[PDB]
Design a protein around this ligand. Structure first.
Ligand code: NA
Ligand code: NA
Length: 277
């Protein structure tokens, strides 16, 4: 049995096709302690990132800030002693995915100004899809962000560095009911259909379609190829520069609070559309 049994895939695989479970899918029903993890953990995952970079902003990704227990992957946070840096969990898939693929997590954001992330990046760091990217903080003055999921993707040129993502209002999704995403587990998925077409789904409903060169890559950073490179699955938290460069970063009191400082993932699952037998 799996934790997602009976929970449908909301995207359309095409006439005459069905969704086939990809083996990277993990519902985290095993024990993998922070130090050393477990055999099952390492069948799919590595600690850290796609490469040795330790992260943006004041982030320093740290292997002992991820663990699997009680049916959940936990990504936690803490102050790096004697510094302003933040130790954060991160895990990355050992193998990448390619379109067409539906990619979904069921997760509870941390109650922090940090980004809680479920996202995808090519080996060369030029192509990115962000499925969960959201900031759970209940701080006074952060209420707008607490009601929003950032639905986005990036294309980069590494040198000289350039970064494009969509920036229209609909890239920050709220349900209109005042839901604070941090308060419960929610499922967020993307159908990465082809290099020019993404569909975002929240709790089983299509909420945004990002389609065509004008929104995927209007500046031509992908040289006409779109979102086409294989991408690794990454589950992390981040202290991001657009926040901490500008005075928003966790306090020691927040980082010390076990009821706020952790981002939980019930499952990640991935499906490929395949012909019906
Ligand atoms: Na490409
Ligand atoms: Na689970």
């Amino acid at each position: 049995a799996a934790d997602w049994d009976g929970v449908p895939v909301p995207a359309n695989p095409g006439s005459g096709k069905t969704w086939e479970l990809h083996p990277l899918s993990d519902d985290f029903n095993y024990e993998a302690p922070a130090a050393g993890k477990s055999t099952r953990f390492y069948e799919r995952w590595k600690e850290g990132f796609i490469n040795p970079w330790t992260g943006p902003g004041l982030t320093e990704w740290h292997p002992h800030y991820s663990y699997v227990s009680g049916g959940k992957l936990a990504i936690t946070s803490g102050r790096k002693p004697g510094t302003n840096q933040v130790y954060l969990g991160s895990i990355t898939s050992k193998a990448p995915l390619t379109y067409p693929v539906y990619m979904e997590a069921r997760a509870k954001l941390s109650n922090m100004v940090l980004a809680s992330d479920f996202w995808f990046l090519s080996a060369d760091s030029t192509e990115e899809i962000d499925v969960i990217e959201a900031y759970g903080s209940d701080r006074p003055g952060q209420e707008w962000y607490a009601e929003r999921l950032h639905l986005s993707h990036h294309v980069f040129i590494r040198d000289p560095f350039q970064d494009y993502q969509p920036t229209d209002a609909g890239s920050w999704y709220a349900d209109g009911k005042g839901t604070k995403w941090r308060d419960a587990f929610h499922r967020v998925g993307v159908y990465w259909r082809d290099p020019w077409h993404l569909e975002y789904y929240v709790d089983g409903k299509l909420v945004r379609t990002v389609s065509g060169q004008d929104i995927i890559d209007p500046n031509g950073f992908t040289g006409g190829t779109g979102l086409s490179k294989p991408m690794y699955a990454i589950i992390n938290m981040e202290d991001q520069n657009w926040r901490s460069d500008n005075g928003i970063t966790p306090t020691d009191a927040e980082l010390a609070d076990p009821n706020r400082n952790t981002y939980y993932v019930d499952w990640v699952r991935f499906y490929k559309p395949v012909p019906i037998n």
